[PDB]
Design a protein around this ligand. Structure first.
Ligand code: CLA
Ligand code: CLA
Ligand code: CLA
Ligand code: CLA
Ligand code: CLA
Ligand code: CLA
Ligand code: CLA
Ligand SMILES: CCCCCCCCCCCC(=O)OC\C(C#C[C@@]12O[C@]1(C)C[C@@H](O)CC2(C)C)=C/C=C/C(C)=C/C=C/C=C(C)/C=C/C=C(\C)C=C=C1C(C)(C)C[C@H](OC(C)=O)C[C@@]1(C)O
Ligand code: KC2
Ligand SMILES: CC1=C(C#C/C(C)=C/C=C/C(C)=C/C=C/C=C(C)/C=C/C=C(C)/C=C/[C@@]23O[C@]2(C)C[C@@H](O)CC3(C)C)C(C)(C)C[C@H](O)C1
Lengths: 47, 215, 193, 187, 70, 40, 188, 49
C-alpha cells in the first residue's frame, strides 16, 4: 500500500474548483442525510 | 389500493425471513394493520424525511417528558393546594388543551392537508407536490387551489364566513376518490370543536370574580 | 470632560460654546467625551480624505505599479471617485485590515476617553503592551517627535488649530462627495472632480 | 383622588406619580389586573418598535434604500423583501435579543422582587443619561410614534400614495393651499 | 366591520349582554349600581360582557345573513 | 455507578434479564454461524 | 444585589455559584440552565465542546488544502467516503474508548471524587504547571474554544452554501469589490 | 483535586489494585475498577496464564 511518507508523498495538495455560483438549496438538501429520502435511507450503519 | 401496507422487517436467522412476505412495492416485510399509513396520508406526509424528523421530535419530547417527571418530584413538587384547583384545571383542559389542540389541528389541515390531499386525488405524484412550507405562505398557490384564500382573513374578522365555503364545507358522505371523509369537512369539524371547547373552558371560577363553582 | 473646560470654542462662534441645540445640556459628561473623541476622529479622517481627494482630482500619482499590470495612472485616470473602485480588492482589504488593527488597538487602551482618558488623545505606540503581538515602537502620532519642541501653550494653540482645520475638512470632503453625486450642488468643483 | 387626565374619575392607586410618563390616565383600571412593571415593559417595547418603524418607513418611502434592495415603496417593501429572500435574517437578531433579554427580564419582573424596572435594559453605551425628563421624553416620543405608525400604515394602505399619506397630499394637511377662493367668496 | 347593520347588531348585543349579565347575583338589570359593579369586578366586568356579547352577536349576525339581510 | 447503582444492577431481575439476554444472543449467533443443525 | 456582568439588567441567578468560581463567569445565563442541570456537568460539556470544535475547525481548514495520498475526497464528502472506507469506524472506536473513560471520570466527579469540571490532567509539555498561569490559560482555552464553535459552524454552513474551498465566500465576494462606493445595481 | 488518583490516570480515583503488593501494582490502570469486583490474586493468576 501507500505508506504516507515512505513510498508516497506525505500531505498531498487537494483538488479545488476556482470559485463558483451558489448551489441551489434543493441541490444539497435533496442529497443531505437528514432532509432527503435517499439520504435518510443511506444514513444507516453497515456491517 | 394494490400495495399492502408494511412497516416491519424480520432478520434472517432461523427461517423467520419468510415472514417478510410480498407486500408490493418491491418491498418484503410484515404487513401492518394499524392504519398509520392512511393516517400519514391524511396528515399530508409525502416523504420519508418528514417521518424521520417527526420521529426525532418525538424522541426529544420523550426526553423532555422524562426530565419533567424527574423535575416535578425531585426538584419542584407542587402542593395539595395546587393539585385541588379543579376549576382552573377544567378551564385549561377545555380551552387550553382541547380547544387549542383542535384549533392548531384545524390550521394544520387547512394549510397543509387540504392542498396536498387534493393534489394527490387530482393525480399529482408525491415528488411534484409543493412542500408544506411552500404551501404555508404561498397564498397565490392556495388561491389557485381554493379560490376563497385570495380574500385573506378579512372575511373571517368581518363575519362574512360564507366566503370560506370552498375549503370549509358540510358536504358529508365519503370522498369518491379516497372513499373516506372529506378533509375540508374534517377541518371545519375541528375548527367548530375548537370554538366550542374554548367557549366551554370559560365556565369555572378562578382568581377573578366571574365563573362557576362546581361545589 | 465638561464642555466648559473643553477646547474648541473659537472666535468664529464668539468665544463661546457653539451648541445651538441643547445637546451638551441634555447629555451627561461621558457622552461629551465620546462626542469630542468622535469629533477629532472625524476631523482627522476628513483632513486626510480631503487632501487625498484633491490629489486624486489633480491626477498626481506615484511613479510605478499599484499592482502588476495596474498602474497608479491607470487607476487614477478615470477620477478620484472611481479610483477606489479601480483599486484591486486585496489592496483595500489590506488597508481596511490595518485600519481595523489601529482602531481596535486605540480602543483597547485602558484609560479610555469615556472612562478617564483625554478624548481625542490617541495613545502613541498603540501596538505596545499587547501579548502575542510585537510591533516596532513607531509612534502612531508624531513618529519623528515633532511635538517635543513645542510648549504646553503652543500645543494647546495647535490643538485648537487641529479642531478648526478638522471641521473645515469634514465640510470640504462632504462638499466633494455631494458635488460628485449631485452635480451643481457644490460649485468650484470642475469636471475633474 | 380625582385623576388628572380624567377629572371625573378617581385615579388608580398603582399609578401614583413616580413612574415616567404618568398622567393619571387609566380609566379601565388595567393596572390592577395587569402588573405595572409588565405593562411598562410592554409599553416601552411597543414604543421603541414604533419609533424605529416610523423612521424606517419614512426613509424608505422618501427614497433611501440599501444597495441590492428592491426599489419599492414601504407598503410593498415587506412583500418585496420576502420575495427576494433576505428577511429572516432580520428576524435572527430579533430572536436573539428577545430570547436572551426579554424572556429572562420578563421572568425577573414577574418573579424576582429585586429587578430593574420595565424597559430598563441598562443600555446606555454613550452615557447620555436616564434622567426623569429623558425618560419622560422617551415615553412621549414613543407614544406619539405608536399613534403615528398606526396612522401611517392605515393611510398608506388606504391611499397607496406618497409620504403625506393623504388623498390630495399636503393640501389635506393645509386647507388654504386648496383654493381659498370660496373662503374669499363667503367673505 | 363593513356594514352599519352588522355593527349595530354587534354593539346592541354587547350592550344587552353587559346590562343584563349577572356575576354572583350582581347585574345592572337587577338594580346593582354601575359604581358597585366596577368596584367589585372591574375590567373583568367589561371583558366578560363583551366576550359573550361578541359570541351572541356573531351568532345573530351569521343567522341574519343566512336568513337574508346582512 | 455508585455502590448503590451496582447493587441495583446486581438485583435479581436485572441480572436475570442480562444473563438471559446474553444467553439468547449466544444461541442466536450460534444459529447464524452454524444454521440448520438438526444433527451433530 | 449582584447583577450579571454580561446582562446588567438581570440579577445573577444563584445556581451559577459564587461570582467567579469558574473562569469566565460573566454571569451569562439568561435561560437559567444551571437550575436544571449541575454546573460541573455543564462545564465538562463546555470544555468538551470547546476542544472538539477547535480540532474540528482546524481539521476542516486543513483538509480544504491538504489530504493524505489514500484519501482523495473533498472535506464535505470525506465523512461519507471514509465511512465507506472504514476509517471513521476506527475513529469512533478509539474516541469511544476515550469517551468511556471520560464518562467514568464525569460520574466520579459528580459523585464527589474531587476532579475539576474538565481537568483530565493532560499536561505533558508543562504549560500551565505554574499555578499563577493556570487560571489565565483556562480562560484562554475557554475563549478560544467558544470562538471555535462559531468558527466551525460558519465553516460548515458557508462551505455548503457557497461551494468554495477555503474562504467560504461567494464568488462575488471573492472576485468582485466588497469595498465599492460607486452605486450598485440589483445583483452583487 | 482527587485525593488518591490513579497513577496511570490522574483524573480517576485510585483502584484497589493500586494499593496492593502485586508486581506492577504501581500503575493503577483500572478505569472499569474490575479489581474491586474480581479478587486481585485470581485476576493476576489469569493475567499471567
Ligand atoms: C510505519 C510507517 C511509517 C514510516 C516509517 C513513516 C515515516 C515518515 N513519515 Mg509518516 N506516516 C505514516 C506512516 C509512516 N511514516 C502514516 C501511517 C501516516 C498517516 C497518519 C503518516 C503520515 C505522514 C505525513 C503526513 C508525513 C509523514 C512524513 C514522514 C517522514 C517524516 C518523518 C517525521 O517527521 O516523523 C515524525 C514522527 C514523529 C514525531 C513520531 C510519530 C510516530 C510515533 C510512533 C508516535 C518519515 C520518512 C512526512 C513526509 O512526507 O516527509 C517528507 C510527512 O509530511 N508521514
Ligand atoms: C393550557 C394549559 C394546559 C395544558 C396544555 C395542559 C395539558 C395537560 N395536563 Mg394540565 N394543567 C393545567 C393546564 C394545562 N394542562 C393547569 C392550569 C393545571 C393546574 C390546575 C393543570 C394540572 C394538571 C395535572 C394535575 C395533570 C395535568 C395533566 C395534563 C396532561 C393530561 C393528559 C393528556 O391528555 O396529555 C396530552 C399531552 C399532550 C397533548 C402533549 C403535550 C406536552 C407538552 C405540553 C408539550 C396534559 C399534557 C396530567 C399529567 O400530569 O399528565 C402528564 C395531570 O395529572 N394537568
Ligand atoms: C392556530 C392555527 C392557525 C395558524 C397557525 C395559522 C396561520 C396562518 N394563517 Mg390561518 N387559519 C386558521 C388557523 C391558523 N392559521 C383557521 C382555523 C382558518 C379558517 C378560518 C384560517 C384561515 C386562513 C386563511 C384564509 C389564510 C390564513 C393565512 C394564515 C397565515 C397568516 C399570517 C399572519 O397572520 O401572520 C401574523 C403575523 C404576526 C403575528 C407578526 C409576527 C411576524 C413574524 C415575526 C414573521 C415570521 C415569518 C417566518 C418565521 C419566516 C417565513 C419566511 C418565508 C420566506 C418562508 C398563516 C400561515 C393566510 C395565508 O397565508 O394563507 C396561505 C390566509 O390567506 N389562514
Ligand atoms: C489555527 C487556529 C488557531 C490556533 C491554533 C490558535 C491558538 C491560540 N490562540 Mg487563537 N485565535 C484564532 C485562531 C487560532 N488560535 C483566530 C482566527 C483568532 C482571531 C479571530 C484568534 C484570537 C485569539 C486571541 C485574541 C487570543 C488567542 C490566543 C491563542 C493562544 C492561547 C494562549 C497561548 O498559548 O499563549 C502563548 C502562545 C502564543 C503567544 C502564540 C504565538 C504563535 C504565533 C502567533 C504563530 C504565528 C502563526 C502561525 C503561522 C500559525 C493559542 C496559541 C491567546 C493568546 O495569548 O494569543 C497569543 C489570545 O489571547 N487567539
Ligand atoms: C495606514 C497606516 C498609517 C496611518 C493611519 C498613519 C497615520 C499617520 N501618520 Mg503615518 N506612517 C505609516 C502608516 C500610517 N500612518 C507608515 C507605514 C509609515 C512608515 C514608517 C509612516 C510614517 C509616518 C511618519 C514619518 C509620519 C507619519 C505621520 C502620520 C500622522 C499624520 C498624517 C499626515 O501627515 O498625513 C499626510 C499629510 C501630508 C503628507 C501633507 C502634510 C502637509 C502639511 C501642510 C505639513 C507640511 C498620522 C497619525 C506624521 C506625524 O505624525 O506628523 C506629526 C509623520 O511625521 N507617518
Ligand atoms: C336572533 C338571531 C338569530 C337568528 C335569526 C338565527 C338563525 C339561525 N341560527 Mg342561531 N344563534 C343565535 C341567534 C340567531 N340564530 C345566537 C344568539 C346564538 C349564540 C348562542 C346562535 C347560535 C347558533 C348556533 C350554534 C347555530 C345556529 C344556527 C342557526 C341557523 C339554524 C337554526 C335552526 O333551525 O336550528 C335547528 C336546530 C334543531 C332542530 C335542534 C338541533 C339539535 C342538536 C344538534 C342536538 C339559523 C340560520 C345553526 C346553523 O347555522 O346551522 C347551519 C347553528 O349551528 N345559531
Ligand atoms: C474534530 C476533529 C477531526 C475529525 C472528526 C476529523 C476527521 C477526519 N479527518 Mg482529520 N484532521 C483534524 C481533525 C479532525 N479530523 C485536524 C486537527 C487536522 C490537522 C492536523 C486534520 C487533518 C486531516 C488531514 C490532512 C486529513 C484528515 C482526514 C480526515 C478523515 C479521516 C481521518 C484522518 O485521517 O484524520 C487525520 C487526522 C490527523 C492527522 C490529526 C491527528 C491529531 C488529532 C487532532 C489529535 C491532536 C491532539 C493529540 C476524517 C473525515 C483525511 C481526509 O479524508 O481528507 C480528505 C485527510 O487526508 N484530517
Ligand atoms: C515624510 C514625513 C513628513 C511629515 C509630515 C507631518 C505631517 O504632515 O503631520 C500632519 C500635520 C502636521 C504637523 C506638525 O508636526 C508639524 C509638521 C510641526 C509641529 O510643530 C506642529 C504640527 C502641526 C503637529 C498636519 C496635517 C494637516 C492636514 C493633513 C490637513 C488637512 C486639511 C484639509 C482641509 C482643511 C480640507 C479642506 C477642504 C475644503 C475647504 C473643501 C472645499 C471647498 C472648496 C472647493 C475648496 C472651495 C469651495 O468654495 C466655494 C465653492 O466658494 C467650498 C468647498 C467646501 O467646496
Ligand atoms: C495601508 C497601507 C498598506 C500597508 C501597511 C501594506 C503593507 C504590506 C506588507 C507588510 C509589510 C506587505 C508584505 C504587503 C504586500 C503587498 N501589498 Mg500592501 N500594504 C498597504 C496597502 C496596499 C495597497 C493599497 C495595495 C497593496 C498591495 C500589495 C501587494 C501587491 C500584490 C500584487 O502585485 O498583486 C503586496 C505583495 C497591492 C495589491 O494587493 O494589489 C493587488 C495594492 O493595491 N498594499 N503590503
Ligand atoms: C481531545 C478530546 C476528544 C476528542 C477528539 C477528536 C474528535 C479526535 C480526533 C482525532 C483524529 C481525527 C485522528 C485521526 C487519526 C488518523 C490516523 C491515525 C490515520 C490512519 C490511517 C491509516 C493507517 C491508513 C490510511 C490509508 O490511506 C492509506 C495510507 C493507504 C490506502 O491504501 C488506504 C488506507 C485507508 C489504508 C474527546 C475524547 C471527544 C473529548 C475530550 O474531552 C477531548
Amino acid at each position: 500500500m501507500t505508506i504516507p511518507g515512505l513510498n508516497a508523498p506525505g500531505l498531498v495538495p487537494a483538488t479545488k474548483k476556482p470559485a463558483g455560483a451558489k448551489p441551489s438549496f434543493e441541490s444539497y438538501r435533496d442529497t443531505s442525510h437528514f432532509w432527503s429520502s435517499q439520504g435518510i435511507m443511506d444514513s444507516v450503519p453497515k456491517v | 389500493t394494490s400495495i399492502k401496507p408494511s412497516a416491519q422487517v424480520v432478520w434472517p436467522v432461523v427461517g423467520q425471513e419468510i415472514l417478510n412476505g410480498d407486500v408490493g412495492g418491491g418491498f418484503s416485510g410484515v404487513q401492518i394493520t394499524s392504519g398509520v399509513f392512511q393516517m400519514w396520508r391524511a396528515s399530508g406526509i409525502t416523504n420519508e424525511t418528514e417521518l424521520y424528523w417527526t420521529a426525532m421530535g418525538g424522541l426529544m419530547m420523550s426526553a423532555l417528558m422524562v426530565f419533567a417527571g424527574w423535575f416535578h418530584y425531585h426538584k419542584a413538587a407542587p402542593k395539595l393546594e395546587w393539585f385541588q384547583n379543579v376549576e382552573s384545571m377544567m378551564n385549561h383542559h377545555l380551552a387550553g388543551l382541547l380547544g387549542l389542540g383542535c384549533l392548531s389541528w384545524s390550521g394544520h389541515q387547512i394549510h397543509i392537508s387540504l392542498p396536498i390531499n387534493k393534489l394527490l386525488d387530482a393525480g399529482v405524484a408525491p415528488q411534484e407536490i409543493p412542500l408544506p412550507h411552500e404551501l404555508l405562505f404561498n397564498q397565490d398557490l392556495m388561491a389557485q387551489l381554493y379560490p376563497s384564500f385570495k380574500k385573506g382573513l378579512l372575511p373571517f374578522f368581518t363575519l362574512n364566513w360564507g366566503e370560506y365555503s370552498d375549503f370549509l364545507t358540510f358536504k358529508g358522505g365519503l370522498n369518491p376518490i379516497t372513499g373516506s371523509l372529506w378533509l375540508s369537512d374534517t377541518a371545519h369539524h375541528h375548527l367548530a370543536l375548537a370554538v366550542l371547547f374554548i367557549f366551554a373552558g370559560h365556565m369555572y371560577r378562578t382568581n377573578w370574580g366571574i365563573g362557576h363553582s362546581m361545589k | 470632560a465638561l464642555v466648559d473646560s473643553m477646547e474648541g470654542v473659537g472666535e468664529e462662534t464668539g468665544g463661546q460654546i457653539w451648541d445651538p441645540l441643547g445637546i451638551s445640556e441634555a447629555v451627561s459628561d461621558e457622552a461629551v467625551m465620546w462626542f469630542r473623541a468622535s469629533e477629532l476622529k472625524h476631523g482627522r479622517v476628513a483632513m486626510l480624505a480631503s487632501v487625498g481627494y484633491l490629489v486624486g482630482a489633480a491626477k498626481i500619482s506615484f511613479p510605478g505599479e499599484l499592482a502588476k499590470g495596474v498602474t497608479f495612472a491607470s487607476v487614477a485616470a478615470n477620477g478620484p471617485y472611481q479610483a477606489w473602485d479601480a483599486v484591486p480588492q486585496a489592496g483595500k482589504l489590506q488597508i481596511l485590515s490595518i485600519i481595523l488593527a489601529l482602531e481596535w488597538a486605540t480602543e483597547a487602551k485602558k484609560p479610555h476617553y469615556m472612562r478617564g482618558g483625554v478624548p481625542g488623545k490617541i495613545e502613541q505606540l498603540p501596538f505596545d503592551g499587547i501579548q502575542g503581538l510585537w510591533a516596532p515602537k513607531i509612534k502612531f502620532w508624531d513618529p519623528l517627535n515633532f511635538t517635543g519642541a513645542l510648549s504646553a501653550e503652543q500645543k494647546a494653540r495647535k490643538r485648537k488649530a487641529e479642531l478648526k482645520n478638522g471641521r473645515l475638512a469634514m465640510i470640504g470632503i462632504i462638499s466633494f462627495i455631494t458635488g460628485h453625486n449631485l452635480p451643481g450642488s457644490v460649485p468650484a468643483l470642475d469636471s475633474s472632480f | 383622588a380625582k385623576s388628572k387626565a380624567i377629572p371625573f374619575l378617581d385615579a388608580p392607586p398603582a399609578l401614583d406619580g413616580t413612574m415616567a410618563g404618568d398622567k393619571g390616565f387609566d380609566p379601565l383600571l388595567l393596572s390592577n389586573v395587569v402588573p405595572i412593571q409588565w405593562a411598562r415593559e410592554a409599553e416601552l417595547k411597543h414604543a421603541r418598535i414604533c419609533m424605529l418603524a416610523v423612521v424606517g418607513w419614512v426613509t424608505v418611502d422618501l427614497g433611501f434604500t440599501v444597495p441590492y434592495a428592491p426599489q419599492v415603496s414601504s407598503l410593498a417593501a415587506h412583500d418585496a423583501a420576502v420575495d427576494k429572500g433576505v428577511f429572516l435574517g432580520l428576524l435572527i437578531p430579533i430572536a436573539l435579543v428577545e430570547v436572551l433579554a426579554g424572556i429572562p427580564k420578563c421572568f425577573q419582573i414577574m418573579n424576582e422582587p429585586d429587578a430593574s424596572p420595565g424597559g430598563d435594559y441598562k443600555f446606555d453605551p454613550l452615557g447620555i443619561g436616564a434622567s426623569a425628563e429623558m425618560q419622560e421624553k422617551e415615553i412621549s416620543n414613543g407614544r406619539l410614534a405608536m399613534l403615528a405608525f398606526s396612522g401611517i400604515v392605515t393611510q398608506a394602505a388606504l391611499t397607496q400614495g406618497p409620504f403625506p399619506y393623504t388623498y390630495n397630499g399636503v393640501e389635506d394637511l393645509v386647507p388654504p393651499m386648496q383654493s381659498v377662493q370660496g373662503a374669499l367668496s363667503i367673505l | 366591520q363593513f356594514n352599519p347593520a352588522k355593527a349595530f347588531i354587534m354593539m346592541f348585543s354587547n350592550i344587552l349582554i353587559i346590562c343584563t349579565m349577572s356575576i354572583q347575583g350582581k347585574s345592572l338589570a337587577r338594580g346593582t349600581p354601575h359604581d358597585e359593579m366596577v368596584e367589585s369586578f372591574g375590567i373583568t366586568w367589561l371583558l366578560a360582557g363583551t366576550s359573550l356579547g361578541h359570541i351572541v352577536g356573531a351568532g345573530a349576525i351569521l343567522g341574519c345573513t343566512a336568513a337574508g339581510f346582512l | 455507578m455508585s455502590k448503590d447503582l451496582l447493587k441495583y444492577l446486581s438485583t435479581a431481575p436485572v441480572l436475570l434479564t442480562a444473563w438471559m439476554s446474553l444467553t439468547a444472543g449466544m444461541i442466536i449467533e450460534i444459529q447464524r454461524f452454524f444454521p440448520d443443525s438438526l444433527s451433530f | 444585589v449582584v447583577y450579571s456582568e454580561a446582562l446588567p439588567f438581570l440579577v445573577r441567578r444563584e445556581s451559577l455559584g459564587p461570582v467567579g468560581a469558574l473562569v469566565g463567569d460573566v454571569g451569562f445565563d439568561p435561560l437559567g440552565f444551571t437550575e436544571i442541570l449541575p454546573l460541573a456537568w455543564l462545564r465538562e460539556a463546555e470544555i468538551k465542546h470547546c476542544r472538539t470544535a477547535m480540532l474540528a475547525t482546524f481539521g476542516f481548514a486543513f483538509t480544504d488544502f491538504w489530504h493524505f495520498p489514500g484519501f482523495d475526497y473533498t472535506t464535505l464528502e470525506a465523512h461519507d467516503a471514509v465511512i465507506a472506507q472504514g476509517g471513521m469506524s476506527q475513529l469512533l472506536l478509539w474516541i469511544g474508548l476515550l469517551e468511556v473513560f471520560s464518562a467514568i471520570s464525569i460520574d466520579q466527579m459528580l459523585r464527589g471524587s474531587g476532579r475539576e469540571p474538565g481537568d483530565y490532567g493532560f499536561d505533558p509539555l508543562g504549560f500551565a504547571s505554574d499555578p499563577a498561569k493556570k487560571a489565565d490559560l483556562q480562560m484562554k482555552e475557554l475563549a478560544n474554544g467558544r470562538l471555535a464553535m462559531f468558527a466551525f459552524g460558519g465553516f460548515v454552513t458557508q462551505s455548503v452554501l457557497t461551494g468554495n474551498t477555503f474562504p467560504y465566500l461567494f464568488d462575488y465576494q471573492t472576485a468582485g469589490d466588497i469595498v465599492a462606493i460607486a452605486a450598485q445595481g440589483a445583483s452583487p | 483535586a482527587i485525593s488518591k488518583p490513579s497513577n496511570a490516570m490522574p483524573f480517576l480515583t485510585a483502584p484497589p489494585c493500586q494499593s496492593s503488593k502485586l508486581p506492577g501494582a504501581e500503575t493503577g490502570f483500572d478505569p472499569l475498577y474490575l479489581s474491586e469486583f474480581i479478587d486481585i490474586k485470581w485476576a493476576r493468576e489469569a493475567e499471567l496464564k
